[PDB]
Amino acid sequence: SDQQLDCALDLMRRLPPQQIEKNLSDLIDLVPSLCEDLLSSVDQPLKIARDKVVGKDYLLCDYNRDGDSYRSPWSNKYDPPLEDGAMPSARLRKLEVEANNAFDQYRDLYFEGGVSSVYLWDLDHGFAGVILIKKAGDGSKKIKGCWDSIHVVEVQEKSSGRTAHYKLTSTVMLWLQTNKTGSGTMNLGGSLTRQMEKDETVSDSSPHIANIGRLVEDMENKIRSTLNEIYFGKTKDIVNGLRSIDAIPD
Amino acid sequence: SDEEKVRIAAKFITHAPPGEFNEVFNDVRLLLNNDNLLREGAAHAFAQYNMDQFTPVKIEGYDDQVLITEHGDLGNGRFLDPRNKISFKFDHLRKEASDPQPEDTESALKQWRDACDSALRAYVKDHYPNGFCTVYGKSIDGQQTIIACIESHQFQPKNFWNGRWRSEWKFTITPPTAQVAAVLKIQVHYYEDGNVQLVSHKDIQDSVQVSSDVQTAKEFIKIIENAENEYQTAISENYQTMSDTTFKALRRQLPVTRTKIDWNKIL
């Protein structure tokens, strides 16, 4: 079980990234004992639901989940409905709404489409949150892709609330596929996780969301840079070592 | 369900990235935890993996290596090495050749085969750093066929990456013409920073003229070389296109206004 976990994780890192949902399902079909452990620690594509009250999309993750229901950031209601689903405090809920709006603009500006959601929760010496972004690239038989990012941030207020410590853990999943005459079918799939910690000043002009916004924006700009190198540089260098157009000397 | 478990185990083993079979096999063994069932329904998978991957193998006493492919499958666990005129038993588990025996396959296409083999080996030595190839000459549904197979790999677990190139070219010879059917495949796994896989393939269907064995093999190799150069050049062009365009359409580097966001304004 402890070792079976290690094996099921290593296996999911090694199988085809386009097959996560099927492979993971299949992997649950043979060690059901690790079902919950697998569902939470394996990177999966983000799922979208529609808020039935106001008709807007939101994203699903474990942090807006209670039992088999999920809480919408728009209406603050669970679906399927629950009498006593876990809710943020009135004060945290206010900040959650400000965060959803600010990150919606961030998404519009860097992604020009897709869906984003933010859910917050309380901690002893501050709070935490998740920022989810999904942008799919549909509209061509020749070229397809999808970006999914998840950012977990932990905030610890310090110096009587004049500064705070921020801890960010971010994962981006990225898939691309082209079907062209010269290069045939090319499929690139995978992911990258990064962590960053910063103290920043907190004030009227630099409030928590602005600090979280800057932290997430930088993290995604750095991750994007690194994926570019790894996806379109490293794998290419490896292709070019398998075969050489010019004759190999000696 | 137990028939379904083995079927899943077998699907998993079959999808091992090049150079990572042992790891995937180990994972799947400890997971199924039924070493008995593993041997039963997932032995068709070891063989299927070896033949899909064009696994190269060294036979004691012969300089080259030969590729394990469906084309050299003689049945009953034996494979043909057409260059050396031997058959051998292959142990798909250990990946070891043994019991080499002479095999004089009835020489109908043999001259053609030997002339293609000779031109292909020189080509593969010139263009594939650790490349191996095998040429078969066989009759398929009545038609004389040359099947040229090329494998090249680089396994660098210490640098956290593996890659493999496979190509397969089938020339159905009906003088003075030949039908050409090829498939080129590439697979790369890089996991030193992050984790990414490239899977790529290209199908080719064409026709060409043929004359004598020696001249025709020379031109088969020119056709292969050009087509494989074309794919490789298109691949690197497509890399540039995905980098500067397709990636941008998912997430830009900067907003349209080309300034980092002003978070106070947004708030």
Numbering used by the authors:
A (entry chain B): 2 to 251
B (entry chain A): 9 to 275
From the reporting publication:
The actin capping protein (CP) specifically binds to the barbed end of actin filaments with a high affinity and prevents the addition and loss of the monomers at this dynamic end. CP is a heterodimeric protein composed of α- and β-subunits and the molecule displays a pseudo two-fold symmetry due to the resemblance of the tertiary structures between the two subunits.
To gain insight into the structural basis for the inhibition of CP by V-1, we solved the crystal structure of CP (chicken α1/β1) in complex with V-1 (human). Remarkably, this “basic triad” directly participates in the V-1 interaction. Arg260, the center of the “basic triad,” forms a bidentate salt bridge with V-1 Asp44. In addition, Lys256 and Arg266 form salt bridges with V-1 Glu78. In V-1, Trp8 on the V-1 helix 1 inserts its indole ring into a hydrophobic pocket, which is formed by CP (α) Ala257 and Leu258, immediately adjacent to the “basic triad,” and CP (β) Gly138 and Ile144 in “loop S5–S6” (a loop connecting β-strands 5 and 6 of the β-subunit). We superposed the structure of the CP/V-1 complex onto the previous EM model of CP on the barbed end of an actin filament. This unambiguously demonstrated the collision of a major part of the V-1 molecule with the filament, mainly with subdomain 3 of the penultimate protomer. The structure also indicates that V-1 lacks uncapping activity, because the V-1 binding site on CP is buried deeply between the two end protomers when CP caps the filaments. Conversely, we found that the conformation of CPV-1 is significantly different from that of the CARMIL peptide-bound CP (CPCARMILs), because the binding of V-1 induces a twisting movement of the CP-L and CP-S domains.
